[PDB]
Each structure stands twice: as C-alpha cells, then as structure tokens.
Amino acid sequence: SDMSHGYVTVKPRVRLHFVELGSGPAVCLCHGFPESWYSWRYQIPALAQAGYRVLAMDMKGYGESSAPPEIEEYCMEVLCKEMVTFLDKLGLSQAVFIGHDWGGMLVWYMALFYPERVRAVASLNTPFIPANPNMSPLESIKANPVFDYQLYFQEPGVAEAELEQNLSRTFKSLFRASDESVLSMHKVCEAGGLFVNSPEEPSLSRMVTEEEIQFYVQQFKKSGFRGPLNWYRNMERNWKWACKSLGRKILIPALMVTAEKDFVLVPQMSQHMEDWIPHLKRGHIEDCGHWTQMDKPTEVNQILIKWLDSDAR
Amino acid sequence: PSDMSHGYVTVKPRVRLHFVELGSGPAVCLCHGFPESWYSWRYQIPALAQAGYRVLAMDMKGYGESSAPPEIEEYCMEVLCKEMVTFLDKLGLSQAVFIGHDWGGMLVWYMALFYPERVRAVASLNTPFIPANPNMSPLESIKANPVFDYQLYFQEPGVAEAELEQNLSRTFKSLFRASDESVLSMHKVCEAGGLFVNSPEEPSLSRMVTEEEIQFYVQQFKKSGFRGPLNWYRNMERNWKWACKSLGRKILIPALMVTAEKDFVLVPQMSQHMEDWIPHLKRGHIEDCGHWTQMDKPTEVNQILIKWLDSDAR
Ligand SMILES: CN(C)C(=O)Nc1ccc(Cl)c(Cl)c1
Ligand SMILES: CN(C)C(=O)Nc1ccc(Cl)c(Cl)c1
Numbered sequence A: 001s002d003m004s005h006g007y008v009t010v011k012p013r014v015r016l017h018f019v020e021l022g023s024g025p026a027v028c029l030c031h032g033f034p035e036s037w038y039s040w041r042y043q044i045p046a047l048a049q050a051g052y053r054v055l056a057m058d059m060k061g062y063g064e065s066s067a068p069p070e071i072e073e074y075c076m077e078v079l080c081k082e083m084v085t086f087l088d089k090l091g092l093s094q095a096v097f098i099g100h101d102w103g104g105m106l107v108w109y110m111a112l113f114y115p116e117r118v119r120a121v122a123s124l125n126t127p128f129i130p131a132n133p134n135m136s137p138l139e140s141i142k143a144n145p146v147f148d149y150q151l152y153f154q155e156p157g158v159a160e161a162e163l164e165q166n167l168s169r170t171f172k173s174l175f176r177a178s179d180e181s182v183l184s185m186h187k188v189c190e191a192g193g194l195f196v197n198s199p200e201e202p203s204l205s206r207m208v209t210e211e212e213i214q215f216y217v218q219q220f221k222k223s224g225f226r227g228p229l230n231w232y233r234n235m236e237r238n239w240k241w242a243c244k245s246l247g248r249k250i251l252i253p254a255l256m257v258t259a260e261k262d263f264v265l266v267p268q269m270s271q272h273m274e275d276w277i278p279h280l281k282r283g284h285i286e287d288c289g290h291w292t293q294m295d296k297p298t299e300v301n302q303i304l305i306k307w308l309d310s311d312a313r
Numbered sequence B: 001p002s003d004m005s006h007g008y009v010t011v012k013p014r015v016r017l018h019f020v021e022l023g024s025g026p027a028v029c030l031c032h033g034f035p036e037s038w039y040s041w042r043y044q045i046p047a048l049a050q051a052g053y054r055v056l057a058m059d060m061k062g063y064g065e066s067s068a069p070p071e072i073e074e075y076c077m078e079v080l081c082k083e084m085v086t087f088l089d090k091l092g093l094s095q096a097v098f099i100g101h102d103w104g105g106m107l108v109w110y111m112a113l114f115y116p117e118r119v120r121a122v123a124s125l126n127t128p129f130i131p132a133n134p135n136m137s138p139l140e141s142i143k144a145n146p147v148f149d150y151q152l153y154f155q156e157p158g159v160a161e162a163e164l165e166q167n168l169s170r171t172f173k174s175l176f177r178a179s180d181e182s183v184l185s186m187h188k189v190c191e192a193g194g195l196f197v198n199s200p201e202e203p204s205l206s207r208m209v210t211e212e213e214i215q216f217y218v219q220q221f222k223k224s225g226f227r228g229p230l231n232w233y234r235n236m237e238r239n240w241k242w243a244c245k246s247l248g249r250k251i252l253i254p255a256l257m258v259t260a261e262k263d264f265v266l267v268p269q270m271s272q273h274m275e276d277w278i279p280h281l282k283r284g285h286i287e288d289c290g291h292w293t294q295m296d297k298p299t300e301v302n303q304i305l306i307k308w309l310d311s312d313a314r
Helices: A043-049 A076-089 A102-113 A137-143 A145-152 A158-165 A167-174 A210-220 A235-243 A297-312 B044-050 B077-090 B103-114 B138-144 B159-166 B168-175 B211-220 B236-243 B298-313
Strands: A004-009 A015-021 A026-030 A053-058 A095-100 A118-124 A254-259 A280-285 B005-010 B016-022 B027-031 B054-059 B096-101 B119-125 B255-260 B281-286
Touching (some): A167 A210, B027 B044, B044 B054, B044 B298, B119 B298, B168 B211
Parallel strands (some): A026 A095, A118 A254, B027 B054, B255 B281
Antiparallel strands (some): A004 B005, B005 B016
16 A cells, blocks of 8 residues: 555456556566565565666466466466566556566566567576477476476365465465475375475564565455466466477576575576577575575665666666 | 556545556656546647656546545645655655646646655646735635636535536536537626536537547546535635745746637636746647647647657656
8 A cells, every 4th residue: 555556457357466666667577476566575665766667566366466267367378468468558668577486487488479578587596498399398397306396286276275275374384484494395295285394383484574474365365376376287388389489599688596595496497598598697696595585685686786777777 | 448557546544546657768747637537638648658758647636536535625735736745655756747737737836836856847738827915815816807707606515516417428518629619608607507508408529529538538427526526626715825835936847838829717828927936937839729728739739748848857
C-alpha cells in the first residue's frame, strides 16, 4: 500500500501485476519459485534511488497476477510473448530485464528470442544453458542426483498438497541461509516429501523476520502452488523452443551473477557462457545461498547498480 | 481501457487514485477537468508517449476508478494538491511535468505555486492563473460576471446531481459539443429548470465525438455519479483562503498557458498580465477551439504540448 500498483491485461484471462517505483530507464525485475515481487524489497528503493524506473513483477501464477490451472500456460514461449505484450501496452520499446531463479531462465529466453525489446539482461544464480538437440531434457535432470525435487514437482496435485498444507512452515523451511538449510532435495520421497528433516514449527532464519514470512503466506492464499509449480511442468516444450534458435548468440549487454552457496544453481553451471554471449559481464557473491536478494541484499544492489550505470545506460 | 496499463496509488486511508500509463522518459502528469475522465486525454496519451515521454493520465479524485468520498472538504485545492504530492512520493518521482485542463488546470497552477520543487514544468489548457484578492469576496467575483451563474447552481448538494445523473447519455451529448453546436445558456440558470433546458431529450451527436466515446463517459460516471466531481466547485472560500497564504510570491518554474478562442467561460482575455506573476511563461492559442480543448482540436494540442516539452521541460 506504500507502493504504486500496476495492472496489464496481456490475454483475455491473463492480467499481470507489478509494483512501480522511480524514474529513468525501465528495469523489469522477475522473481523465482516460490516467490513474489516482495523478493526484490531491498532492490526496489536502491535501484530507484540510483536513477531507474523499477517494475517489480508478480510473475504468472503468483500474488495479484492471473493464475490459470492449465500447465501449457506456464511454458517459456507463452510467458515470454506475454512479457512482450506487457511492454507494448505500457508503451515501452525496451526494458532492462533482471531475473532470479525461474525469472532468470525467463530473462535469458527474453534476451535470446526478443533482443530488440531487452536493453540489457541480468541473471541471479540462473545460467544460460544452450539446448542439446541430441539429449532429452528428462535425461539431464536424472544425470545429476541434486535435481530429484524437479521430478517430484512433475505430478499435479502432489507437491501442491505438501506446499499448501502449512504456508508458515513452507516459507520458513525454504527461505533459509545455506548453513541453516535442512532440505534433502537430492533424495525426495519416502512419504515425507520436500520437508522431512524440517520440524512442524521451524525456526526463523537470520535473513527473514516474522512479518516478511507472513507476507508470502497471505500472497499464496489467493491462488496456491498450482501456477508456480506449472513452471517446472514444461521441460519438453521449453527444450523444443530453445532448439529452434540453435547457434545464434545473445549480442545485447549481459550480467551473470553467481551465488557461492547455491547448491542447485551452482556457479560451475555458468562456465563457457561467454562463447554464446560475447558481451557477458560477471558478478560473484560469497557466503550467498539460493535466496540471493534476501541473503546478500547490499552485494546484489552494488553489483546491479554498477553494471546498470556502465552497460545498460 | 483494456489496451491500457492501469496504475493505482493509495494516497490516504480512504483515498486511492487511478491512472493510465504509457511511454518512457520524463514523467508527464495529465489532469482532466469537469465532468471529465483520463479518456479526455485519448489523443494526447499516444502522441506524448511517441514524442519520448512517460504519460500518467489521471482519473482525478471523485472520477472513474479513483476514490469518491461524499465530503465537500475532500475536494478543496489544499487536500487535492497534498494527495498529488503523496502520489509522486509513492511512485518514487521527485518531479513530474503537470499538464491540466479546466479544474485540473486550476490544480496544476496551485501545484506549481505551493510545490514548485515537485513540478518540473507546468501547462494549462483554458484555465488561467489568477492571484487571490485579499480585499474581495469569492462569491462577489462569480456574481460580477453573468456567465458564471451555473457555478451558483452547482453549490447546493443534490440539486445539480439529480439533473446530471437523470440521463447520462443526454448529459455528455449536451456538454461535449463544439461552441457553434452548443445549446447551453449558463448565464441564466434561475428562470428556467436546469442546465439542459434548450437541449432536447435525445440530442444530436457532436462533430468531435463518436457514439462509443460518449458511451465510455456514461459507463465511468455510473460508478460514483456527480457528487465528487461537483464538490470541486463547493470549496470557493476555502480555496481563496489557501491562495491568500502564498500572496506576493511568483511561479519561477517553466510554464505554458494555452488559450482557446471559443471557450466562453474560460475566455483568453482572463489570462492577461499572467507574465507579471509567472516570469518564465510561454504562450499558446488555438483558434476555432471551444471549452473541450483536447476533444475539439487534438492535433493542435499535441503540437503545442510536444514543442513546449522538448524546449522548456527537458
Ligand atoms: C530450474 N530451477 C531454476 C530450480 O529448480 N530452482 C529452484 C527453486 C526453488 C528451490 Cl527450493 C530449488 Cl531447490 C530450486
Ligand atoms: C471554474 N471552472 C474551470 C469551470 O467552471 N469550468 C467549467 C467546466 C464545465 C463547464 Cl460545462 C463549464 Cl460551463 C465550466
């Protein structure tokens, strides 16, 4: 309510919500899973004070944005085309796209398929992986044992039941520092699911407060986890769309920000990205887990502003 | 509306302001008049955005999707201006160019007077800047010129509301007309019954508007009615008292005064000697242009606004 709330209808059933702060070049912030525009809480005033027009999104299936139950509505192709329509209705020819996690995956696809609409691209934790035309996306998940949670997120209604059971428990178990993390994502089920080692009433992490956790709880009461989980349920569709580009390079200015303690989106996954992205710049945050914006907000703000002032402007 | 980006800012616990947003560049805040909408800037919105400006076309307090409290005090220039400051604060805008028409034009002058640090540049269509006379009554100023008789008719709450809400399609078809098509006789609102006495039950469509454009204003005014819009007129003494607190000071920021040759209420002669109080004042004049400036001559408005923005606001 201290924020300016924007609403853009991209499709007759799809309406995208965003918070707006500041003046200057348009900066579109895209959150990950299971997040909110609120994940960019420390970045919003910092980027606006630096001289940028901040557009922090509530991604499709999250918060005040439309959440259709259809799985097909959450493929990279549909999501990217909606983001282009979002820019068109706002009268923006270009925008700087900064994404984290699943938002980071979206921003790379936006830079690859629509470079004329992306002034500059930045990604927190998520690397740019060029699709292998000879290897199946299911084979890539099963190769590394750490991605076992993704297979558990495939069947609709299964992960939804566990994540919606107790919202306060869900966010308190997920939004933790790496040394405070008790998640065993490498071996999901036996029965317990994602939160087996986590207790019924988990302790509050050093990054978040009770008020911050309760904000995500209220937001996820509106639509649940179906929409957010459907982002994982389009692995074959996204692989086929990424194969359509093949060989082409992202020529626009780019930033890759790696997190030292992110065990799922490891910094080593970002290697050789400069071969596919010639104008790639690098950022690295030590003592930083998966929840980059929450874990090290000061380091994120400094890295983003420095790059925006030199490469995006 | 469905093709537009819709923004919402809660300025007070009971007051929420709606706006349409288009383009990138310096922030340009468009403020409509009475009994209008953000839609009155329909020709200006894509034109200023294409010219390289971030357009914020307001639904003023008491109109459309914006909050409409029944209280008269909520529509005085003091409350309205403070809410616009809060609107800029929550959007993270240090400054914005303020372009107003009619009652919105009055707002932009007060915004430039009391808050010049938040106004990059000020522009007004038809509405002049008149410094309040401390030794002259506000009620006597309206009674001096016979043309402002309709304002006295707009004072009693519920009276004008009943006539304006009776038939919304008839209301907008009788008001939104060119000067040569105008059937209104606002100088004698006492002898006859209402404002639309000379107008027929089913008035003809004006050369400036289409049937679908008239239908938009009808749908918008079904939400809150005419109480909120008419309360802008019911704060004459309160607005005069606030204007007297500034007395002596000049508007030092860049300014533009756009006069309309055929506006019989906000006559171009009312804008005379404005440069004495506004040193950096620029001028614009549209011939064959009635009260509904944006509606009447859209191409002329766009050209005058773009030329002034590129030279005085940048
Ligand atoms: C494919 N991607 C980006 C993910 O699976 N990200 C992701 C998001 C949330 C969590 Cl809790 C985990 Cl372990 C990974
Ligand atoms: C004090 N002002 C600006 C007005 O009374 N403006 C105004 C608005 C609408 C109409 Cl129909 C008329 Cl006659 C005057």
